[PDB]
Amino acid sequence: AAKDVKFGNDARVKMLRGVNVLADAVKVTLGPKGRNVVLDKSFGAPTITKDGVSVAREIELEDKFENMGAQMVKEVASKANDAAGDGTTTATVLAQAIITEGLKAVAAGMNPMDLKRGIDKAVTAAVEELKALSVPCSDSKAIAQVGTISANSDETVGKLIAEAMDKVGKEGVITVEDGTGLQDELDVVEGMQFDRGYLSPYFINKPETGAVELESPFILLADKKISNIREMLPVLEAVAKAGKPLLIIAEDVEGEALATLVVNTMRGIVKVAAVKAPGFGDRRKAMLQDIATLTGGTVISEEIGMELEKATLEDLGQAKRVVINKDTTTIIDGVGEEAAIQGRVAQIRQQIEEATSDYDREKLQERVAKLAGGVAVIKVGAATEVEMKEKKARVEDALHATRAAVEEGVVAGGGVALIRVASKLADLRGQNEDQNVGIKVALRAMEAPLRQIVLNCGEEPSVVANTVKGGDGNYGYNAATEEYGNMIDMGILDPTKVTRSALQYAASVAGLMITTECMVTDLP
Numbered sequence: 001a002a003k004d005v006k007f008g009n010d011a012r013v014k015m016l017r018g019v020n021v022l023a024d025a026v027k028v029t030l031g032p033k034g035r036n037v038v039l040d041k042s043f044g045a046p047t048i049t050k051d052g053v054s055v056a057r058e059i060e061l062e063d064k065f066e067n068m069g070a071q072m073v074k075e076v077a078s079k080a081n082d083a084a085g086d087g088t089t090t091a092t093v094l095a096q097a098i099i100t101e102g103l104k105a106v107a108a109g110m111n112p113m114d115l116k117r118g119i120d121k122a123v124t125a126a127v128e129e130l131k132a133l134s135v136p137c138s139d140s141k142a143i144a145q146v147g148t149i150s151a152n153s154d155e156t157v158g159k160l161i162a163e164a165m166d167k168v169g170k171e172g173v174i175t176v177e178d179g180t181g182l183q184d185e186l187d188v189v190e191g192m193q194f195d196r197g198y199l200s201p202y203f204i205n206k207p208e209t210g211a212v213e214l215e216s217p218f219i220l221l222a223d224k225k226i227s228n229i230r231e232m233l234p235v236l237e238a239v240a241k242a243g244k245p246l247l248i249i250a251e252d253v254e255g256e257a258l259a260t261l262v263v264n265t266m267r268g269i270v271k272v273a274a275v276k277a278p279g280f281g282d283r284r285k286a287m288l289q290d291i292a293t294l295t296g297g298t299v300i301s302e303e304i305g306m307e308l309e310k311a312t313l314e315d316l317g318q319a320k321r322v323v324i325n326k327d328t329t330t331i332i333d334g335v336g337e338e339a340a341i342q343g344r345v346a347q348i349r350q351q352i353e354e355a356t357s358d359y360d361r362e363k364l365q366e367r368v369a370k371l372a373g374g375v376a377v378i379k380v381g382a383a384t385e386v387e388m389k390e391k392k393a394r395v396e397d398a399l400h401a402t403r404a405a406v407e408e409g410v411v412a413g414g415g416v417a418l419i420r421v422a423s424k425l426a427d428l429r430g431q432n433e434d435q436n437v438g439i440k441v442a443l444r445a446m447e448a449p450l451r452q453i454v455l456n457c458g459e460e461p462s463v464v465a466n467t468v469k470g471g472d473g474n475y476g477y478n479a480a481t482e483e484y485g486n487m488i489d490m491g492i493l494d495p496t497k498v499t500r501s502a503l504q505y506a507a508s509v510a511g512l513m514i515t516t517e518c519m520v521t522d523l524p
Contacts (some may be wrong), residue, residue, distance in 0.1 A: 004519075091505050119511055147398045173376070224251060
């Protein structure tokens with residue numbers, strides 16, 4: 001199609017306009033006292049939300065270049081949110097800052113590549129300082145505290161999260177589920193989770209969580225690739241007749257088969273989800289065999305001879321629940337007699353015994369840990385079903401925050417951590433004047449989020465930022481009560497992973513956008 005291209009400064013100012021629109025839309029929700037954003041819907045009743053994720057997702061500008069700028073910033077912010085569990089608004093605000101001062105410096109005639117190098121150096125030093133400043137969260141008390149803080153200062157949610165982590169381990173698989181009755185049940189079942197996401201977003205059954213949930217699906221395990229529909233069509237017909245959903249775990253599903261599956265999914269004829277098998281090579285075969293033993297259904301391997309056409313309904317695996325996220329999927333309480341699992345664990349143990357290379361032994365150890373760890377499911381209970389749904393959402397959010405905290409650690413929230421890091425790094429220097437300008441740009445950008453939070457709070461951002469910079473350690477400003485002091489003690493927590501990932505992804509997108517020289521769009 002016909003293309004219109006912008007070269008140099010005009011493209012950059014279009015980019016800046018787009019990112020400014022996106023960040024102005026999404027930034028008012030930042031902070032405990034954040035403004036509301038009215039999102040119009042075609043249904044008739046607009047949705048009033050103060051969540052940055054929804055506001056960012058709704059933004060789609062008209063001008064093509066501003067639209068692309070907003071789309072890149074939104075994409076990197078979404079990547080940060082998925083990686084960490086939170087911080088998309090912080091990442092967007094940081095990106096808008098870095099882009100604004102970086103493009104302002106570029107217009108001054110400085111070399112964009114040196115600015116990018118300086119920004120990257122400053123962000124690397126900031127990550128190092130943030131790791132130094134991070135407070136570890138490993139014992140049960142800190143886990144419970146983080147869970148409580150994340151779930152709007154609720155002690156029950158933190159207690160449940162800490163109990164689950166103690167039961168299954170800090171690296172174990174923990175899942176929430178609707179619970180019957182007032183009591184909150186917590187039991188460990190035989191399950192598995194591997195980092196594999198849905199093939200297409202149209203497979204999503206729950207748009208609220210952006211995940212694919214299956215009430216009680218069937219498991220299809222084929223080591224071959226699926227491109228044609230005729231081989232698997234008898235199995236799909238059989239499972240549709242059985243009245244249950246189907247999970248397809250193949251090496252790769254694409255072509256006509258994927259399109260047919262997507263069409264059947266959106267038309268509501270049958271609810272089936274397809275996900276690629278974990279790993280590659282013989283590791284993928286071993287994982288498929290492990291899943292087969294867990295779900296009690298023999299894997300369809302064309303090498304030994306069985307085919308998809310001859311596959312029976314009973315040959316398919318079965319499990320209680322299957323949850324597929326954007327990048328990870330979980331199998332919960334797969335049906336299968338326990339001696340098979342014990343035998344598989346034993347064989348993996350001998351494979352450890354004769355394992356020679358370190359990496360193969362590590363992979364097999366990870367395999368056996370995943371297989372024998374199980375899945376600890378939390379069944380949230382409440383007196384009222386809507387209260388139960390709200391508690392389930394809060395518990396899921398607290399679980400994400402607690403997992404991030406256990407991974408990295410906890411640092412002062414509310415933007416205080418970035419302020420402290422910038423104050424520590426104010427003495428950093430590069431190898432050129434442009435690199436030094438980039439470093440200063442990065443430091444001011446790191447200061448920006450706290451300024452935005454206290455601007456939403458209504459105070460003067462400059463005074464609060466200066467006072468927080470003057471302080472040391474975790475001392476900061478609590479916008480909820482308009483008081484200073486130790487942010488950790490006051491209970492304003494942010495996992496180190498969230499802030500680190502937000503800063504890194506904002507820096508990445510800002511470096512990409514600073515060095516852009518041209519863009520190509522379709523004509524309006």
